[PDB]
Homo-oligomer: A and B are copies of this chain.
Amino acid sequence: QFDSTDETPASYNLAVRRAAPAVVNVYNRGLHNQLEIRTLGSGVIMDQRGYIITNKHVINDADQIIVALQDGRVFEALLVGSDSLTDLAVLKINATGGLPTIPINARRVPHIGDVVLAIGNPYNLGQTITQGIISATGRNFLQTDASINHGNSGGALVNSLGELMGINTLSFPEGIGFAIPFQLATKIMDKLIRDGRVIR
């Protein structure tokens, strides 16, 4: 009939290996005295210093914020700042051995129709990769049909090369989810780190 032994399966594994290591699980814990998870989501390690972007609604009223990396390391995180208007928050973790960081191509712009992968921790199932495309822009938000669920907020939306296109945030309905464009997220992050708040 046919022998597919030497053929190559169509795959986005390259984007996964490049980006997924930098996407963390974020847990919002509350203190009767025992510390339990109140809500959860994802976050993206933006640079070597341990700065991480996540959504503000994921960390609101946390008595403790925990960050878990795909490689097994767990950290208690410091809340650097947050911004309600963009629903973004920045965390800081103090790691010793080096941290994986999300690929960022400063010159790339998402285009409608681009294939994208959503990376997050839906329903605490553990890191999950889902695929779709950029459905619309301007919304400003990117819209995508890459399946997003509770637990994906604050995680990454990357293209087939693993470059960050945005930070998943909202899920409207089938296949309607939104991400904050990476240019805006990066700008808000720098302001939160520099000023501790977004001056407008």
Is there contact, CB below 8 Å, between B161 and A114? no
Q: Which of A135-177 touch B at CB < 8 Å? A: 135-136, 138-139, 143, 145-149, 159-163, 171-176
| Shortest distance between the CB of A97 and any CB in chain B (Å) | 16
Is there contact, CB below 8 Å, between B10 and A160? yes
Task: Indicate if A194 sits at the interface (CB-CB under 8 A).
Answer: no
Chain B residue at smallest Cβ distance from A117:
B113
Q: A1-B103, A11-B114, A147-B175 are in contact. List 4 more A-B contacts (CB 8 A).
A: A9-B159, A129-B134, A130-B135, A131-B145
Chain B residue at smallest Cβ distance from A160:
B10
Q: Which residues of B contact A14 (CB under 8 A)?
A: 113
Q: Name the 10 nearest CB pairs between A and B, nearest first.
A: A147-B175, A13-B113, A10-B160, A16-B113, A12-B113, A9-B159, A4-B161, A10-B115, A130-B145, A11-B114
